[PDB]
Amino acid sequence: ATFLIWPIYPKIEANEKATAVWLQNTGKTDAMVQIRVFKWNQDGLKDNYSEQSEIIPSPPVAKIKAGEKHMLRLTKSVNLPDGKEQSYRLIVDELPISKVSFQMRYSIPLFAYGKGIGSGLTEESQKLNAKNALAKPVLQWSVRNNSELYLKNNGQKFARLSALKTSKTGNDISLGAFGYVLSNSTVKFAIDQSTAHELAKTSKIYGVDSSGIKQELIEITKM
Amino acid sequence: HHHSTGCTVGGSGTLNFLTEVASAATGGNISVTCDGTDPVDFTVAIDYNVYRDAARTNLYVVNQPQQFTTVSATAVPIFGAIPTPKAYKDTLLVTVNF
């Protein structure tokens, strides 16, 4: 199955009841998909998923013929807690309908907002976030072996990190599996020894973050 | 205006290779193509083995994410090899994470 998926970063702002994600089967063969939304949390220092009724997708199953563009509706059931960002994964499963074959699962992030906070991907939500001190990721870092890097987000917005730097104008350091540090969450992940010691010779390090409109550097404080 | 990124994930075909002890191989075709003016990271996890590597020195560990990015296409190379199929067919689950 071949799918175009748009947007790859959907969100549901506070004053919205619903958003849409488009799935077009750009293949020559029909496909069937199961569509599900899971609550997403990083407790236990690892990504967890669970059943959820805060956001309901429609339809939950769909046949999408070759060339066909289907609209997923994603409905916020009731208002979400004030000032908070809720995190989810939207999951699309291709249903099957010496040779090994392939069966795709696509998983995209989905964020929804309560009053006082927004995605910052629009003017409205930008002005909302300007008046809110914590409408942003606020990151702290710490290394500890048994070498693992811990990242704690004190902000109310997730960070999406592609790289770490020891300085604003420096180069991104080694890092031979990490990206999302959800709001009010702390994530833990493995790093090389050389990485750990390199972080040891400093106290402020920097994330390349793409949660907002543009890529931007954010500062990470030592715990 | 502000670009909303979309990705095509196909790409746009499988791997084909008793009780003759030798080393057999094969390859397939999966791509990811976004449309930002900015690279997009994505992650691939696959649940007798399979590799991101021509010359097969980089395993898809069972359920372990494997890192990727793009620029305005990108292949998700898969290279198979065999000295947990059954009959012989296997069905592998490939998860592409944005």
Residue numbers in the entry:
A (entry chain A): 1 to 97, 108 to 156, 161 to 190, 193 to 239
B (entry chain B): 7 to 18, 28 to 32, 43 to 44, 46 to 73, 93 to 117, 120 to 129, 131, 135 to 138, ...
Authors' account:
The major class of these adhesive pili (or fimbriae) is assembled via the classical, alternative and archaic chaperone-usher (CU) pathways. The biogenesis of CU fibres requires a periplasmic chaperone and outer membrane assembly platform termed the usher. Here, we report atomic-resolution insight into the structure and biogenesis of Acinetobacter baumannii Csu and Escherichia coli ECP pili assembled via the archaic and alternative pathways, respectively, whilst also highlighting some important deviations from the classical assembly mechanism. The non-classical chaperones, unlike their classical counterparts, maintain subunits in a substantially unfolded state by utilising a register-shifted DSC and a distinct subunit C-terminal carboxylate anchor.
Archaic Csu pili mediate the formation of Acinetobacter baumannii biofilms, which contribute to high rates of nosocomial infections. This pilus is formed from four subunits, namely CsuA/B, CsuA, CsuB, and CsuE, and is assembled using the CsuC-CsuD chaperone-usher secretion machinery. To gain insight into the structure and assembly of archaic CU pili, we determined the crystal structure of a CsuC-CsuA/B pre-assembly complex, composed of His6-CsuA/B and CsuC (to avoid polymerisation). Crystals were readily obtained in spacegroup P6422 and the structure was solved using Se-SAD phasing to a resolution of 2.4 Å. The CsuC chaperone has a canonical Ig-like fold with two 7-stranded β sandwich domains (D1 and D2) oriented at ∼90° angle. Whilst the refinement statistics for the structure of the CsuC-CsuA/B complex are good, approximately 40% of the CsuA/B sequence was not evident in electron density maps, whilst another 7% has very poor electron density (Cα atom B-factors higher than 80 A2). The remaining structure of the CsuA/B subunit reveals a double β-sheet sandwich comprising strands A, B, and E (β-sheet 1) and C and F (β-sheet 2) and β-strand D, which switches between the sheets. Nevertheless, the ordered part of CsuA/B provides sufficient information to conclude that, as with classical systems this pilin has the incomplete Ig-like fold in a six-stranded β-sandwich, in which the absent 7th strand (G) leaves a large hydrophobic cleft. CsuA/B interacts predominantly with D1 of the chaperone CsuC via edge strands to form a closed “super-barrel” with a common core. Four large hydrophobic residues from the chaperone G1 strand (Val110, Phe112, Met114, Tyr116) are donated to the subunit to compensate for the missing G strand. The C-terminal carboxylate of Phe152 interacts with two highly conserved residues of CsuC.
